[PDB]
Paper text:
The various VEGF-A isoforms are all active as homodimers, differing principally in their size and their ability to bind heparin or accessory proteins called neuropilins. Domain antibodies are the smallest (11–15 kDa) antigen binding fragments of immunoglobulins. We have developed the dual dAb architecture using VEGF dAbs fused to human IgG1 domain and demonstrated high affinity binding of VEGF dual dAb to human, mouse, rabbit, and pig VEGF. The VEGF dual dAb is unique in its ability to sequester two VEGF dimers per molecule, most likely by a “side-on” engagement mechanism, whereas other common VEGF inhibitors only engage with VEGF in multiples of a 1:1 interaction.
A more detailed view of interface between dAbs and VEGF1–107 shows that Vκ·dAb interactions with VEGF are concentrated on complementarity determining regions, whereas the framework of VH·dAb is also involved in the paratope. The N-terminal Cα atoms of the Vκ·dAbs (these present at the C-terminal junction of the Fc region with the dAb in the full-length VEGF dual dAb) in the co-crystal structure are ∼70 Å apart. Orientating the N-terminal residues of the dAbs against the C-terminal linkers of VEGF dual dAb shows that the distance between the C-terminal residues can easily span the distance to enable them to attach to the dAbs when bound to VEGF. When considering the end-on mode of engagement, in silico modeling studies demonstrate that it is highly unlikely that the two VH·dAbs at the N terminus of VEGF dual dAb could bind simultaneously to a single VEGF dimer, although it is possible for the Vκ·dAbs at the C terminus to do so (2:1 and 4:1 input molar ratios of dual dAb-VEGF). The N-terminal Cα atom of the Vκ·dAb in the co-crystal structure and the C-terminal Cα atom of the VH·dAb on the opposite VEGF epitope in the co-crystal structure, when the structures are superimposed based on the VEGF molecules, are ∼77 Å apart.
Numbering used by the authors:
A (entry chain V): 14 to 108
B (entry chain W): 13 to 112
C (entry chain L): 1 to 108
D (entry chain M): 1 to 107
Amino acid sequence: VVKFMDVYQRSYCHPIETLVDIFQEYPDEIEYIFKPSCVPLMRCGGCCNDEGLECVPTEESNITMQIMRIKPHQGQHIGEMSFLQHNKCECRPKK
Amino acid sequence: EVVKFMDVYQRSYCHPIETLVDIFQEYPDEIEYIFKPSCVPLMRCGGCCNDEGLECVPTEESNITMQIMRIKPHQGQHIGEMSFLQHNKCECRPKKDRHH
Amino acid sequence: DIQMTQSPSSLSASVGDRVTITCRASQWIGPELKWYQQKPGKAPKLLIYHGSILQSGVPSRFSGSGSGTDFTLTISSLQPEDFATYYCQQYMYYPHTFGQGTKVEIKR
Amino acid sequence: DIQMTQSPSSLSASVGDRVTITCRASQWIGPELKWYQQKPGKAPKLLIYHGSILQSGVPSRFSGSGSGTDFTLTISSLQPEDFATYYCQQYMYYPHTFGQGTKVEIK
């Protein structure tokens, strides 16, 4: 059994490795298929346990990954793509 | 530096990953209590199979027990044991949808 | 009941000084701690909740830090209207419990 | 280009026997490997893709395994119709290279 305290601490608003579809982060380019189709990024996750608060990023940075870009039939190539990640997260009020 | 292609693939390829799941989703029937924490950390199937016809799904499941504070607002609370579903193994299985 | 040990009981300070009040919880309460300002003949005024988040309309010279068992209220630069008694309150478990308060007095 | 090395080159087996065929890739190709059955003067039939997933309508006695560099195709109980040549193909990198093939023969 996991103690309530550790449950709370572990699920409290923080940066957590999250698997994000590339088409979300780049919905303008439908020409290419991406591979892999999803990447692992640190993003804000968790609960604040207050109805009027919400978990939000307060420090950001860019990370760069090699992704295969696939033109359906013509060909493919591995280039660099940059993605947003979250370095620090905070419970802040909604409005 | 720059995450090499092979590593991006392997780390994103389908597997069980710690995921933050809202309790009200896992128990949408319960009406009187409010839960603290409102969300829990559970190993769950996540990531991409890299094939439109395949999807990632659990092949091995289990249960884990956690202490969750159950609050009747303005009245009181108790710390109650609650069990949640986990995913131990994930595999890329073909979808049920008709082939496109 | 969760016991809140506030300290110190009483301070003397001059306008402009930096003031540091502490509050200890007998048991873990996460970040769920509020700080109140209390002046004669008024109801207590909420300054800070969730440990560190300022209430709307509260000067930025008030800050709060800590999580779990040990907490701190800081006033970066004391102003005349800041002389008062300050209290902590945990709201993790019912019943919500208070510190005994810190009385912030003018130096003579 | 990825080099696919398939073994054995040929093999003789009896009906009912279990048959095992291997492919090695020269570098990591993930799970993205197909297995084809090719009979003389016909179209190659896709048996398995993504390393271990049966194409629809392929009997269950066919199975696949592996990820990375080392893969295996197993036929649990051999049938007269299964005597053919079997090819592995990788589809991680273009061009999609093949293995030399393995001929499964009657005793």
